[PDB]
């Protein structure tokens, strides 16, 4: 919707990997953007 | 010893000394350090701050 709302931080990792792809992993038994 | 890339999990211990208030004071707070007179306050802060 046309309004506003500020995201707040959870969780940072210091994992520190070299990320080049992006997927999701989602139940088989109403989208995203 | 391994060194890599992210050195910065696996530190010493760290010291926390006693507070005190409405005297100067050179703190070091979180790697933030000044010189000031840390008194308590009223400003609110999200828990994220």
Redesign the interface.
């Known amino acids: 919707p046309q309004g506003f709302s500020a995201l707040?931080?959870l969780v940072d990792l210091?994992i520190?990997i070299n990320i080049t792809r992006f997927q999701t992993l989602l139940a088989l038994h109403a989208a995203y953007y | 010893f391994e060194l890599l890339?992210?050195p910065?999990?696996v530190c010493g211990p760290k010291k926390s000394t006693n507070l005190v208030k409405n005297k100067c004071v050179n703190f070091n707070f979180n790697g933030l350090t000044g010189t000031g007179v840390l008194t308590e306050s009223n400003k609110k802060f999200?828990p994220?701050q």
């Open positions: 707040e931080p210091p520190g | 890339h992210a910065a999990t999200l994220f």
